[PDB]
Swiss-Prot record, chains A, C:
Name this polypeptide is given: GTPase HRas
Consequence the record notes for mutating residue 118 to S: Abolishes S-nitrosylation. No stimulation of guanine nucleotide exchange
Entry EC number(s): 3.6.5.2
Lineage top rank: taxon: Eukaryota
Motif Effector region: positions: 32-40
Function of the protein: Involved in the activation of Ras protein signal transduction. Ras proteins bind GDP/GTP and possess intrinsic GTPase activity.
Consequence when changing residue 59 to T: Loss of GTPase activity and creation of an autophosphorylation site
Cross-referenced InterPro entries: P-loop_NTPase (IPR027417), Small_GTP-bd (IPR005225), Small_GTPase (IPR001806), Small_GTPase_Ras-type (IPR020849)
Subcellular location: Cell membrane; Golgi apparatus; Golgi apparatus membrane
GO biological process: adipose tissue development; animal organ morphogenesis; cell surface receptor signaling pathway; cellular response to gamma radiation; cellular senescence; chemotaxis; defense response to protozoan; endocytosis
Glycosylated residues in this chain: 35
Gene Ontology molecular function terms on file: G protein activity; GDP binding; GTP binding; GTPase activity; phospholipase C activator activity; protein-membrane adaptor activity
Annotated consequence of substituting residue 37 to G: No effect on interaction with PLCE1
From Swiss-Prot, chain B:
First and last residue of the signal peptide: none
Superkingdom classification of source: Eukaryota
Annotated ranges, domain N-terminal Ras-GEF: 26-170
Residues of the full protein shown: 566 to 1046 of 1333
Disease: Fibromatosis, gingival, 1: A form of hereditary gingival fibromatosis, a rare condition characterized by a slow, progressive overgrowth of the gingiva. The excess gingival tissue can cover part of or the entire crown, and can result in diastemas, teeth displacement, or retention of primary or impacted teeth. GINGF1 is usually transmitted as an autosomal dominant trait, although sporadic cases are common. Noonan syndrome 4: A form of Noonan syndrome, a disease characterized by short stature, facial dysmorphic features such as hypertelorism, a downward eyeslant and low-set posteriorly rotated ears, and a high incidence of congenital heart defects and hypertrophic cardiomyopathy. Other features can include a short neck with webbing or redundancy of skin, deafness, motor delay, variable intellectual deficits, multiple skeletal defects, cryptorchidism, and bleeding diathesis.
Protein name per its UniProtKB record: Son of sevenless homolog 1
Effect recorded for residue 158 to L: In NS4; promotes constitutive RAS activation and enhances ERK activation
Organism lineage string: Eukaryota, Metazoa, Chordata, Craniata, Vertebrata
Self-association and partners: Interacts (via C-terminus) with GRB2 (via SH3 domain). Forms a complex with phosphorylated MUC1 and GRB2 (via its SH3 domains). Interacts with phosphorylated LAT2. Interacts with NCK1 and NCK2. Part of a complex consisting of ABI1, EPS8 and SOS1.
Domain Ras-GEF, residue spans: 202-441
Tissue distribution: Expressed in gingival tissues.
Length: 166, 468, 166
């Protein structure tokens, strides 16, 4: 069966890591251990075709900024995450996309823009601005919740469809 | 068995139930509990658990304030003695002296072990986590008064000890089996710091002095910079400055390697530069500097450099193999790296990034409390996972390298500044443009460029010499 | 990799802590700070194999003599230390060996007899006398200095070889 290598990218300090964790973690209990083998591997059924997800999430390593090229080059598809209560992370999305395009040497890499709600602070990025940014890049936009797991399957499954339809 | 004081006058005498403590499934391992029960187990009368003490003092600040911890162990320390028993009453009523067998047993088997273990918590607190006291003078005053007013000669030795330790820490030499190797020089001779550069210093001595530099930076990172995922928060410059110094040095080196390559426009000279950097990588492997290995690999995999097909075509076959092995260390989520690290003989310099991701994901992936029977227990198995990681870190910080520092080469590398006054985005674009100027996209023809280096480009090799 | 639980025992002041810190950190501690119970870890390569050493440094002061059974139960091998300028500490060694044998209910417990402070001239226990004792226990005798690092690796690594061949 096919293995997709997805890479999550985006600003640190705003709950990016919730995405992969909520995806993988036995989302009906919580005893999570990132240490163990294949707590980043996940067999799933997307549109009836079984496939294996390989998620690289290097959250915490954001200051190793010269390592991004190496990490990005490993992936077939990209999840670009910002926090909806952090405008800076939204504005950084552009540089992440230009960097991805450059290490893949391509102008259409499969990617998804993901707006992540990581707490109960006030939204400062409206859906509309995000849709518009996503439309200008020609990529899907998806919002997720770091508490309720809402939108997390949609985000990854959408990215796989984006890869399959490339 | 043995009788405890009343739970009304000594809170740490409450019986264990699933409403205050939960064990995992040869001493027990605690999965969750109340602060009271955690502190009781931290200082249990039956057994000591030194790995539990390290775990608690590393991670407690996420569920309990320092002032409140001190109040709780001061409370645990003042154990009420039992009243005289019937056999003691009857002896006294005949003017005899009591045996006091149960009071003597309670002192020897409960009070004395619980009080030493409380003192041991204090000792570890002051000796390995003194920053609680640096950031709070009142907390230190209370600790000194608590320790300074402990009466009883069974405790006397450790009380005098901890007093002296606290006083030293307030104002605040290595032995090797072998002698360190001779410092190696190439084209730049000792003292001629203006000539120092990637090709003029000896590649062996570059790897050595960078290894010493990075080992010092690695050894300086304390667990206070990690717990609470604080290196990722807004105040990370306050809370994590030794961690951030290390990461930024690693980033500088990587960018310095990238810059050395793409600013060498002549293809023959660039192949010499790339080849020398791979020779430095080889000595990193030798010295177990995995941080240096990944600096070099990150430079080779960067955008400006990875695309230089003409340069890598002319690299000696044996060095494609060295670079390809080093790159495989990072594949499959660092599978082979983790294996290599857990098999070498230290000293080494680990790669810090893996630990960072594991600590952060552990803190975001696990609830800070567990709800059981309408009670909120502290989830302690989450804190043990984090302290497991910080304990691995600290283990690789003990062993020093047997290498001589060369001050001038150290100063040169400390002061490296590839970006200069430019921002990261400008400098990153500069490197990539240089890459397109010196090896254009297909099908544009490959230009020629004049040499910039006057001195010989022949590598002196990475096998050490040894005069008498 | 295999993990080994070593325990360092002996009278107070003989150098148990100084030996362990010398082994672990290549550093000699000049202050005399009475131990209650300290723990250390060391990854090391012995006879071509990689192992994790879990070293427990114990209290030698008589005040803590009722708290030994708990650590003697867990330890896999014991480093029995005395100081060569201290006859009383050598006489106390008999008592540690006896207590270990009892607690572990075995006559074949891996241990090594260590005679510390061999960097000093003023010696009051003779090698012959210590060696005679070691042979009657059927264990090796090694003289060490925590100050000059003499014999330190030899003692800990010898003990590890014995746990291996148990
Ligand atoms: N000259 C010399 N002094 C030593 C040596 N080993 C230890 N000492 C000194 O002896 C004193 C006691 O050392 P220490 O390690 O604290 O002994 P200990 O066995 O751990 N005692 P305790 O059981 O109370 O923890 C210290 O002053 C230390 O510097 C040695 O090999 N040579
Ligand atoms: N087959 C098309 C191609 O370009 N193959 C290689 C040619 C040269 N090259 C070697 C290389 C450059 N930077 C690296 C970093 C790590 C491992 C290998 C390399 C990488 C790709
Ligand atoms: Mg000691």
């Amino acid at each position: 069966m096919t293995e997709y290598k997805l890479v999550v990218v985006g600003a640190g300090g705003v709950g990016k890591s919730a995405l992969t964790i909520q995806l993988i973690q036995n989302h009906f209990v919580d005893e999570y251990d990132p240490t163990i083998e294949d707590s980043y591997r996940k067999q799933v059924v997307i549109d009836g075709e079984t496939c294996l997800l390989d998620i690289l999430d290097t959250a915490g390593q954001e200051e190793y900024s010269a390592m991004r090229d190496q990490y990005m080059r490993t992936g077939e598809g990209f999840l670009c995450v910002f926090a909806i209560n952090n405008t800076k992370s939204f504005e950084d999305i552009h540089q992440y996309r230009e960097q991805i395009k450059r290490v893949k040497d391509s102008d259409d890499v499969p990617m998804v823009l993901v707006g992540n709600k990581c707490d109960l602070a006030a939204r400062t990025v409206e859906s509309r601005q995000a849709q518009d940014l996503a439309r200008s890049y020609g990529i899907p936009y998806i919002e997720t919740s770091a508490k309720t797991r809402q939108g997390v399957e949609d985000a990854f499954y959408t990215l796989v469809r984006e890869i399959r339809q490339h | 068995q043995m009788r405890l004081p009343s739970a009304d006058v000594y809170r740490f005498a409450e019986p264990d139930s699933e409403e205050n403590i939960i064990f995992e499934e040869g001493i027990p391992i605690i999965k969750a509990g109340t602060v009271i029960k955690l502190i009781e187990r931290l200082t249990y009368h039956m057994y000591a658990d030194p790995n539990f003490v390290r775990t608690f003092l590393t991670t407690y600040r996420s569920f309990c304030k320092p002032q409140e911890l001190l109040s709780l162990i001061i409370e645990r320390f003042e154990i009420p003695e039992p009243e005289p028993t019937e056999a003691d009453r009857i002896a006294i009523e005949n003017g005899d002296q009591p045996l006091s067998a149960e009071l003597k047993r309670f002192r020897k088997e409960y009070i004395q072990p619980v009080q030493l273990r409380v003192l041991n918590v204090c000792r570890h607190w002051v000796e390995h986590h003194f920053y609680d006291f640096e950031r709070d003078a009142y907390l230190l005053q209370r600790m000194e008064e608590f320790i300074g007013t402990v009466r009883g000669k069974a405790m006397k030795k450790w009380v005098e000890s901890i007093t002296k330790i606290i006083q030293r820490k307030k104002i605040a030499n290595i032995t090797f089996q072998s002698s360190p190797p001779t410092v190696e020089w190439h084209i730049s001779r000792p003292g001629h710091i203006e000539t120092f550069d990637l090709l003029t210093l000896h590649p062996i001595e570059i790897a050595r002095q960078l290894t010493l530099l990075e080992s010092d930076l690695y050894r300086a990172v304390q667990p206070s910079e990690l717990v609470g995922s604080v290196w990722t928060k807004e105040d990370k410059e306050i809370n994590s400055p030794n961690l951030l110094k290390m990461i930024r040095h690693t980033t500088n080196l990587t960018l310095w390697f990238e810059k050395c390559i793409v600013e060498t426009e002549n293809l023959e000279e660039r192949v010499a530069v790339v080849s020398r950097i791979i020779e430095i990588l080889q000595v990193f492997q030798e010295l177990n500097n995995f941080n240096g290995v990944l600096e070099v690999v990150s430079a080779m995999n960067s955008s400006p450099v990875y695309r230089l097909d003409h340069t890598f075509e002319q690299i000696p076959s044996r060095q494609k193999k060295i670079l390809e092995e080093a790159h495989e260390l990072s594949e499959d989520h660092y599978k082979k790296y983790l294996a290599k690290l857990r098999s070498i003989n230290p000293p080494c310099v680990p790669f810090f990034g893996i630990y960072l991701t594991n600590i952060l994901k552990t803190e975001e992936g696990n609830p800070e409390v567990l709800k059981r029977h309408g009670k909120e227990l502290i989830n302690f198995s989450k804190r043990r996972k984090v302290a497991e990681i910080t304990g691995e870190i600290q283990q690789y910080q003990n062993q020093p390298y047997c290498l001589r520092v060369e001050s001038d080469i150290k100063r040169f590398f400390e002061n490296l500044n590839p970006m200069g006054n430019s921002m990261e985005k400008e400098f990153t674009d500069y490197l990539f443009n240089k890459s397109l100027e010196i090896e254009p996209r297909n099908p544009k023809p490959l230009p020629r460029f004049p040499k910039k280096y006057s001195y010989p480009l022949k590598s002196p090799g990475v096998r050490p010499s040894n005069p008498r």
